[PDB]
């Protein structure tokens, strides 16, 4: 299958084992912003669901399928690959919706669905929007979508902005310098200090932060899920030119994302921005190997290149330059193994 | 086909050795001064057991125990390590000018070849609750390389079990599970899954420390003699217990910790993770009952802790305990692989 | 075949009036100084409403309110009381030399025969949550004796309710029910009764006081006008509510208190059992949801509190609450007759 | 029936409503001395149960029936008059014992049993042993007992002893002196002081105490359940001669009880004495209206007469005199309404 060809078995096993836990479902459900916004987008756009056929991709415990039922869908196909599909079935039964919701256990790339649907709903977003590569499964499912169908979410915007955080930058070295001693219990560890530094720097930092560390308005990269093909997510080249609003040292790029549900009655936004209430997605920061000085009014130009890998994630390649000075830096990070700093 | 691969799912092995490839993890273990300081003391205080001897270090990591063996005068130390850390260990060997005494052998101890038999084996095979990671079997397996009258550091492992009271912890885990009692979460009835939730939430061993005054009886000791034990002895571990209750009250579960002894020629050195001792990175482990038991002082609490090794490098744990005088009985199942760090 | 006996189980009445035959209970009520002092202020500051008037004291107990009416100048006071406390009332009337003004008439106000119509009715008909004991219906029934131009003290009653958060209270009640989850209590599996236990423990309204900071919205007010209301109006009491949540968090239930006003000719005197006021022997009352509701500040919490009168001189309470934006809904049935005294 | 003939309906309705609560079952079950001693008595005398027919009188949630089953009984008829019988039935089913335990809802004086039984088990003891008058129901059940039959408990011993407790005595007047004031909000209450005193003294005091307040070795009155008849419990006369071990003022009599399960293997005792761990029965004290001075070596003689009433309890009459001085005191108390003093 398309899933198998693009995913290492070892990664897939652990991934779906992780989502087999009710505790992870509770963590997602207890995010009020997430759950409430999904509910609001579906119910306030009830004409997009009433008497429609719906496909729910990666339904987990089934919550979005229930919301689609509340809005009056005629039939909902709920697809889930983890063992959570068992529990979703229990809820479908216990909520007396077996006549309207059918749970299909398996990967959406592999299951057989009988008919074309009117709308696909899903929560495919990971860290930095793209982590887990579930957006590809979501787009792959469009093989079941009628030509005039819709997607909830309809678009996703990843946002990038330069930040200054001297303490975050220094912290890497404080930790790595553990290795810089000539006699740790009689052992000279200093030869590994460089390796330790590199290792810390390859890890995106998952946590939140004061918006006052941001030095420029974000750059936006938009994926239109109604137009995109799944192949469009294998390589994501995000050019940027930031107009510096503040003068200082730039230590890296901060990432967050929004998605929009564009229905017939209204458009509803779900944002993970640092200006908004915190979510279980937090935000993500990637450090440069060296900070860049930029005056207010300078331009910081470069690219963020995301290269998908077989571990259901991305390698992040970042290059940045201060145009007015020519000062340049970069980093290459592994999104599969972020550092949870929060 | 090897002993390791036959008892281990590839998926589990991949993530396991990936985890131990990280220098940040080596640092976390090394910075446990109780652990590191006690190992050095055990080896240097028993320098005669190493002086001009051939040594095997099982799962050497960055090699710190090999370096202790070298300080103690070992003629030759074979340092076996299956993760990519083995290459970092070789870098330290070279930078400490010990190429003449420490020889890194990359790979699994169940699969590599050694040129000769050794006089003593050293390792840190202890995981959480002693047995997690199933490294003790690799440790015992390496005895195929041990000369008939060879030694092992550590020489023995003591598992301690004792009943505890902690209503706060118990209701902490009950509060989490009650989420799945909701009859209308955003209009959805979750109550059918309440049973599954409690089961899942109570399968988690609780990792943290506690005040010794929560213990309700003197501990029971289960000893593993690593000189005598065979690998197969650890596939199914049945630990009987009979506690003489010292205080009346609710027993919410069993607390676990372990000691290991290094029985050398000069002296015996103990490494303890007991709640009476300085805290280590192993902390202590508590297994909750789904329903507490009441016992009065002078009563006896009897039963079995059953550990079945699984193919995920861990154990499925079965605890059954009853108050002998009343027949009040509790029985819980735990997944040692996935604890709750508190 | 009186109105009282028609709406009341004999077993309930016997115990009810036996309870109120105890002097120790009269002492408890009288020693509530907010209560006794406010009643005296309402009556004496409005003395013109009593001076040379005919008074009916409904459920007079030891007679304290009748003595206040006599202090205010009442020409004649009929003090009706159905418990054996009527006899102690008579003793106090004689020892206080008020035999020419206070006339104890033993019996139920629904069954006695009064010699004439009265200018004003006085009583303390309020139980826990205001409505417990169904004494308000006896109070209203007594209006058959009230002149058209007549007054009632208290004149109106305001029920207040507001959502609260209190995880510790919620946890206390579940810790109690956890007992019936045991799969082997002395070798017996109890767990089949765990549902029944939770229902029973959460049926208990909680009587005690609390910090006003646990309240998550402005209270809603339900007003009963005693001059206007009819007995039949209290058989089914439906209180709709819509709260504008001022704080985010889990709502564990609704808190209840009441105010009564004495609307006299000279001034209105208020007696409040609100948690912002000095504690009374009424305290405050909290009804727990079996499952808490989450709401954010700005959301609205709407639903109904429905009280259905029963033949044990109390009400069967049903509360349904729903977060309007999410449809998160919770309900509970409470037995007002038998509260949990937590104080 | 025999039950309805000796019990007022109003009392019976409240009584069985009370025992309908799972919270009350939980309360009794959590008394470990109580629950544990019954289990011990039954299990350690397994030969009185193994393959036998059993009747459990007032089984409540059914716990004693399950112990009889654990001891190997062939068949247990469990009789319970409250709605708790519905919960017992649930437990029998969920515990897979429907083949061995038959729940029979109803009063034991009114149900029919299909066969005679080898042994009757019950927990009929109330405060001061006799409160609730369930011992009569227990004795009544002997119409179903075979001539060899045994009874668990087999005998009941009521103990009584004189005590001194100056502070408990003075407490009564401290409370009653509320009424001794000439202007409570303008009202002279003093005429009711005597009635208030009398009311406090008619209440037996339920709590525990230090054994050092006892002034003499207890006197024991024994009910043998194998021999006693129902009628024997309608009038209980307990004579006493106390030989005073200490000099001081005697403020009343203290009561507690033991029961023995006299089985074929051994006799097990359940005691509520102040020398033993506390139970939910506590101990009971009945004050004298006036204390009696006795010297060490003096004799305190008199009678404790218990007279059954139709409220499922007893009127208590105690008369005592000091033989060497002729000094005399008495009291009349109402066991149905004790003062719970324990803190
Ligand atoms: N936080 C998040 N929302 N993370 C992403 C959400 C992942 C959810 O979707 C499921 N899922 C992921 N890929 C799938 C596929 N190919 N077919 C079917 N179900 C799939 C996961 O098991 C989980 O329940
Ligand atoms: N807390 C701890 N001390 N945990 C255990 C420590 C295990 C260490 O030994 C290595 N290891 C585990 N199993 C092995 C095997 N079969 N052959 C070779 N190396 C192995 C791990 O990669 C890690 O460095
Ligand atoms: N705490 C309180 N204020 N409780 C309410 C007040 C109850 C008082 O009024 C009496 N009472 C109740 N219903 C009555 C009726 N139908 N006729 C005559 N007297 C009656 C009670 O015996 C008690 O003295
Ligand atoms: N703490 C205690 N041991 N209290 C006494 C125990 C009383 C128990 O016996 C029941 N009971 C009382 N009289 C009964 C009768 N005549 N027939 C059947 N069941 C009856 C009560 O409902 C309660 O469950």
What about the largest sheet of chain A? 7 strands, mixed
Whole-number count of domains of chain A: 2
**Fourth CATH level, the homologous superfamily of the largest domain in chain A:** Hnrnp arginine n-methyltransferase1
- Structural category of chain A is alpha/beta
Shape of chain A: globular
CATH class of the largest domain in chain A reads: Mainly Beta
Could you state the oligomeric state of the chains shown? homotetramer
In CATH, the architecture of the largest domain in chain A is: Distorted Sandwich
Proportion of strand residues of chain A: 25-35%
CATH topology of the largest domain in chain A: Hnrnp arginine n-methyltransferase1
End-to-end Cα distance of chain A, whole Å, is 37 Å
Which H/E pattern describes the elements of chain A? HHHHEHEHEEHEEHHEEEEEEEEEE
Family (chain C): Belongs to the class I-like SAM-binding methyltransferase superfamily. Protein arginine N-methyltransferase family.
EC number (chain C): 2.1.1.319
Region (Required for nuclear translocation) (chain C): 213-246
Organism (chain C): Mus musculus
Structure, explained:
Chain D: The modification Phosphoserine is found at residue 82. Chain D: It is found in: Nucleus; Cytoplasm; Chromosome. The structure is a homotetramer. Chain A is an alpha/beta fold and 342 residues long. Chain A has two domains: 1-153, Rossmann fold, CATH 3.40.50.150; 155-342, Hnrnp arginine n-methyltransferase1. Helix content of chain A is 24%, strand content 35%. The first copy, chain A, contains nine helices and 16 strands. Chain A has helices at 2-6, 9-18, 22-29, 32-43, 63-70, 84-94, 134-140, 166-176, 193-201; strands spanning 53-57, 75-80, 101-105, 117-122, 145-152, 155-163, 205-207, 219-224, 235-243, 248-262, 267-271, 283-294, 299-309, 313-322, 328-334, 339-340. In chain A, the strands form three sheets. In chain A, strands 6, 7, 8, 10, 11, 12 and 16 form a seven-stranded mixed sheet that branches. In chain A, strands 3-2-1-4-5 form a five-stranded parallel sheet, with helices on one face. In chain A, strand 2, helix 6 (84-94) and strand 3 form a beta-alpha-beta unit. The longest helix of chain A has 12 residues, at 32-43. Chain A is globular. The A-C interface holds A 32, 36, 39-40, 70 and C 294, 296, 325-327. The complex binds the ligand NC(=[NH2+])NC/C=C/[C@H]1O[C@@H](n2cnc3c(N)ncnc32)[C@H](O)[C@@H]1O (4 copies). The site of one copy of the ligand NC(=[NH2+])NC/C=C/[C@H]1O[C@@H](n2cnc3c(N)ncnc32)[C@H](O)[C@@H]1O has 20 residues of chain B, from strand 2 and helix 7.
